[model samples]
Target chain A: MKKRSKARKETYSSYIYKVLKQTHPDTGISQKSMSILNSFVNDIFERIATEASKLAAYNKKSTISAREIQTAVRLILPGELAKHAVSEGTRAVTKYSS
Target chain B: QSRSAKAGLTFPVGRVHRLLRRGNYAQRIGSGAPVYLTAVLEYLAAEILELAGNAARDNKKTRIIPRHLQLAIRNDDELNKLLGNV
Candidate 1:
């Protein structure tokens, strides 16, 4: 975890930056760009998690599971994007489940 | 292009002027920047408000609420960072 220093800031997972840096070896990322990228990823996940939480609550369940996340992806993403997301998610889950 | 009197009256000169002042640039900006920014802002607002309206309609409500705005923002990733806190 890395702490961003802003007038108002919060802690974020630094693993995103690490992966981004490794994505392109030729070009180096600036500190500002890395922070912005981190925030972008964080914001996306926050919305998805919020939707998943709501789905769990709607089902009268205390714990959110992979099923809730799949539903959340469908709700948060539109049409083809949602379809692809669910497909990829299912594939990933299958790999781990077996 | 000729600036018609009605067009002059309809355009929000004061708000555009205020927006330029808020930029606080050390160097003078390009002449087109203000107009471009104003159009961008207006278009962005309309897009967000349209989404909010859809959310309101989905809930069978006449007025848009904060939650509606949040859900609207969720529709577009470009707006996520800009209006995510809303």
Candidate 2:
């Protein structure tokens, strides 16, 4: 049997669950909705990857930081969604740093 | 209004790599954690304007003053919660 041969980024399925449980603990995700959510997450993640890299490059930096991701989120996701991601990201980054 | 962290606080550039590695690539991060944090906050400001820009445009209102931003912020659940702290 021929197996699929390709590399792919690891999906944040469990983290998504962790976040979901934190936000809406009672809500259950259906397969279709999970699929959509997965796609959406990947889309946004890639967007940040692109913009965050660009941001680092422009800033003469070599790596992506929580800051890069934060800026990238705003670049990709509009409005308060960006705020939510950014605040939580900074919180996560700080907690990790400390 | 945003609160500022003290100047003494600094982040090890490589330390950031670990954070994201723990979180996901899934990415560094560069030197000066404070600077990085500021950059993030600045992006937030840009995001606010972008949202306000969209909100104003939705009603064909060209001027992006505070109210439009308020309207945009209120429209989203996360923004309202996060912004309420500020």
Candidate 3:
């Protein structure tokens, strides 16, 4: 795990490494690639949060919801990407709940 | 501004009428064709000129130059490509 900034908490590189290992048990993942993936994931979430916040402000609301997240996903992701993201998110939620 | 006169394109009406007639598959141009065409041309010119003027101002130039207009057109990729083809 490496610190992104003084104000921002570091994303644990090991967590991503472990997740990758589960998917590809035989293949070796490089340290640099894991670090890059961590930053990429962080950037994606940050963008989603930023857009959701703007949508909230636009509607004169302070609280964010699943509706906001769905809207944010649509606004942030384009076409097929957005569809994949939504399906993936639903699957994750279902798997987590079960 | 005085309300007495309606501000419009001072372009020659006969030239516009002829152009429209030629463009319309050599068909007889409608009475309203020149009026509408002139208005559309005037609107488009104003929009493009404003964009170029703003570009010039951003570059700290007092006069809107050809470079400003080129930059303005180039910013829109589709428009740029269309103009390039033409």
Candidate 4:
């Protein structure tokens, strides 16, 4: 609804908000909490994009997968909770799909 | 990086060992799996910190003045779900 920082760029946050808003409805996580989580998710994605570019410098293809994002989160976050969130999210999707 | 508050509590040595051997931590941890044990400890620490913060909000007094941390330890649904899966 409201923007946090200009550096994040308004449009970018909206794109993240839309994707996460869809994901959170079924997650049962409170939107208030997810408001914070979205900020984190965006930051993590930005850092990963940069890191992927670095990999590309070394002749590696810059392919960012969920696993690479998971790695990036691990590289930056205090612990593995961020990565676990991804694994658990996938697990929930699998459970829901079946 | 010092636990400062929580030191020598339950060292996740077992978890670190398991991560190195089983690679489960790697499955979730990404990049190098060094200090894989701390990953679990860090996860638990975050939940406990959240609980401590909740307790501070309500201003409770007790052995664990951070009552929310205790409550989170007891009631983190996702954590319990993971335990159940294990």
Candidate 5:
């Protein structure tokens, strides 16, 4: 099995690659496409985090919950995207023991 | 800032009202309705501009361009759909 040999900068690249392989086992991707996907993922994550922080800040609260995230996704993402994000979020937590 | 005056659209409210009038099935909008519409429109402008700016910065661009806006809007599925019809 292949594994990362040394400590490197942290990113979701491995998981992203795995997902790509699982989704399209035979297809190959370009280096540029993976780079773009990584950048796009991080951009989305930052936007969601910033929006969630804003939601919590407006109520003068220091802690954010799932509700805040849901609300933030709605505010920051466009309509249908928000729904998909929310559903995926819900899916993760439901499968997780929390 | 003085608290005496409320923030209203300095842009011609009448222009906005005229657009509403152009709608095929629309009846009429109150004069004050356009102010609220103006506020929402301004909010949408800021939201889209900020998103485009984010896209430009991601591209290592100091200045935002129409391509940045197109990239941003396209990446956003719902926003793409909203503008796609137009």
Candidate 6:
């Protein structure tokens, strides 16, 4: 396995940091913050969505739904409270809507 | 995007070895985890390289990044569902 792909460091970081800077109120979000958000955005979100898509594919859903997002969040979010918040809220919403 | 992951993913044999060596290669890739995902990733990786190479082959700056890989993974239908629930 190769150690690195071409950095594209300049091209890639700009697009990423731009989105992160938008979310971050701080005029200058630290490099660390940008890195954190970047990974979270790319890895966590993708993994969760990937999992949800797996389920959706079995059912053959064309469009991704809120449940997919919820499932993604449940899988990716850190901390018990964050996870619980997602689960409880999802259950509540489903209950109320149903 | 960092070059390490991209470089690591450069070839198939290495990919199979690396991904397979990880805990459950049989259940994952053998069952079609690394095998399939790597195939798709290679396709995307090739496209990115092709696009960049075509765009500016001599630029030296032309390169594939992590986001491109992310895009590649996202575009994949099967990979997209790897983590999603129906």
| Best-fitting candidate, scored by DockQ | 2
Better of 3 and 6 by TM-score: 3
Per-model i-RMS: 23.3, 12.3, 27.5, 15.2, 18.5, 16.0
Candidate 6's interface RMSD, please?
Answer: 16.0
Cα lDDT computed for each candidate against the true fold: 0.47, 0.49, 0.46, 0.37, 0.48, 0.38
Best by TM-score: 5
What range of 10 consecutive residues in model 4 chain A has the weakest lDDT sum? A20-29
Residue A12 lDDT (model 4): 26
Question: Residue B16: error of model 2 in Å?
Answer: 12
Query: How well is each residue in A1-98 modelled by candidate 4, as lDDT tens digits?
Result: 64665334321234333333343322222333334433433343345444434443454443333344345445544434556644543443233234
Please list the residue runs of candidate 6 whose C-alpha ends up more than 4 Å from where it truly belongs after superposition.
A1-28, A78-98, B1-86
lDDT of 3 by residue, A1-98 (tens): 64665554334345444433443343333444334334544454555556656776788665544455557766765565466555544443333234
Per-residue lDDT for A1-98 in model 2, tens only? 44578644335344344444443454433443334334544444445566777887888776765667667777766575666756755764564445
RMSD of each: 22.3, 12.6, 28.6, 16.1, 20.9, 17.1
Error of 2 at A13 (Å): 2.8
Instruction: Estimate, for each residue in B1-86, the C-alpha lDDT of model 3 and write its tens digit.
Output: 21101223332334544543553322233343333333322333333444555666688765545666667657755335423311
Comparing 2 and 6 by TM-score, which wins?
2
Name the runs in model 3 displaced over 4 angstroms: A1-12, A94-98, B1-86
Error of 5 at B6 (Å): 52
Q: Each model's TM-score?
A: 0.44, 0.48, 0.44, 0.31, 0.50, 0.31
Could you give the CAPRI-style class of model 4? incorrect
**Which of candidates 2 and 4 reaches a greater lDDT?**
2
> Model 4 off-target regions past 4 Å?
A1-41, A56-59, A89-98, B1-86
Per-residue error (Å), model 6, residue A22: 10
Provide per-model DockQ scores.
Answer: 0.02, 0.09, 0.01, 0.04, 0.03, 0.03
Model 2 agreement with the true structure over B1-86: per-residue lDDT tens digits: 11223221122223323444454432344433324444343344334445555676676664444556567777766656545411
Correct interface contacts retained, every candidate: 0.00, 0.12, 0.00, 0.00, 0.03, 0.00
Candidate 5, residues B1-86, lDDT tens digits: the string is 21101333222334444544453112333333333333333333334445666776678765555667667778776767544511
